[PDB]
């Protein structure tokens, strides 16, 4: 039950992907919908307006889905590699009240990326069942940048 729910394919449409903020100006736009695994082009990743631990990227499956894992990836920009090392996951079913993802009682800190091109998979165990997924970067190298895929099924 570990299928790509449509970040890369865009079965998860642009408007289902949002965030607390994103980095943009005259030359570049690193919007939430850029957070699609293996995306190419310029500005091929989500980037928050600013770098801190209170930021998040949100996916709205619009349906209830069984999420079994997430895959994350960094990006290289102007010869510099940016990526998220550690992140938290929260979830909701109304998009206002958010449930942290715990494991062994404690709040789960996932180990994400160590470079900018290699994708890294993280299981959700136990399988999370939700409409709204959130990912919260907590540490990172140089800057917060994210391309991702949600793995699951109906």
């Amino acid at each position, epitope marked *: 039950c570990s299928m790509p729910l449509g970040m*890369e394919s865009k079965a998860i449409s642009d*408007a289902q992907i949002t965030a607390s903020s994103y980095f943009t100006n005259m030359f570049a736009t690193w919007s939430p919908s850029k957070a699609r695994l293996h995306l190419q082009g310029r500005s091929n990743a989500w980037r928050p307006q600013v770098n801190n631990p209170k930021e998040w990227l949100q996916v709205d499956f619009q349906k209830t889905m069984k999420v079994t894992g997430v895959t994350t990836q960094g990006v290289k920009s102007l010869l510099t590699s940016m990526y998220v090392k550690e992140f938290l996951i929260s979830s909701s079913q109304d998009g206002h009240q958010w449930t942290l993802f715990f494991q062994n009682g404690k709040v789960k800190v996932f180990q994400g990326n160590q470079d900018s091109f290699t994708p890294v998979v993280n299981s959700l165990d136990p399988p999370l069942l939700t409409r709204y997924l959130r990912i919260h970067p907590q540490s990172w190298v140089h800057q917060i940048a994210l391309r991702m895929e949600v793995l699951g099924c109906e």
Partner: antibody
Amino acid sequence: IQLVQSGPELKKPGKTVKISCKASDYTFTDYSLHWVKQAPGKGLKWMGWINTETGDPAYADDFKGRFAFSLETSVRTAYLQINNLKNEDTAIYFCAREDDGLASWGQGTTLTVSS
Amino acid sequence: QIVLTQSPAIMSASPGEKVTMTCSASSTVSYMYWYQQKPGSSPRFLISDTSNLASGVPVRFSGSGSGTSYSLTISRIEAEDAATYYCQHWSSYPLTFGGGTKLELKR
């Protein structure tokens, strides 16, 4: 920016054709490639795309089956194969470099299926 | 999956006149892209990201809209603007073109 597709093809019903798409510069694994089909009186139909950094192809619903996308990165070329040709494959095939839109297009490749 | 619907199918205008042509999505998209195709030629990139002129494109062209409604305008049409104009979105699977607005010149 230029993309140069190969030339016109006449093929027998049921055979296979392989159409190519060569790129001028080498910013090549930096942008995705798309295939678009145009039938005589129709507009444009998206066939799908291929990731040029990873080689992952993706097909549109109407093109899952007898179509294959592929690459040769050394020579900066994308390919389009069509298996078991039918009359409905008769058309112009474009390739397009995605860059905040389909920003460059090849000149097209006419395919004619006929015995 | 979002469908694009362009009106009018055919439209007609005299050199110097303004033309507006519309493109409605079935559901919100992020941007709308536009293309011009003359017969026997490849399509050509006109408008990137709803309202930005693609490279090499003359300034009598402009696009706008948001949500599900977008439009292309040629402010002062010339003879070489006779063509078919396509809108296109890539906000979800699959990538889609509208069915084209054909601009004929009155003379």
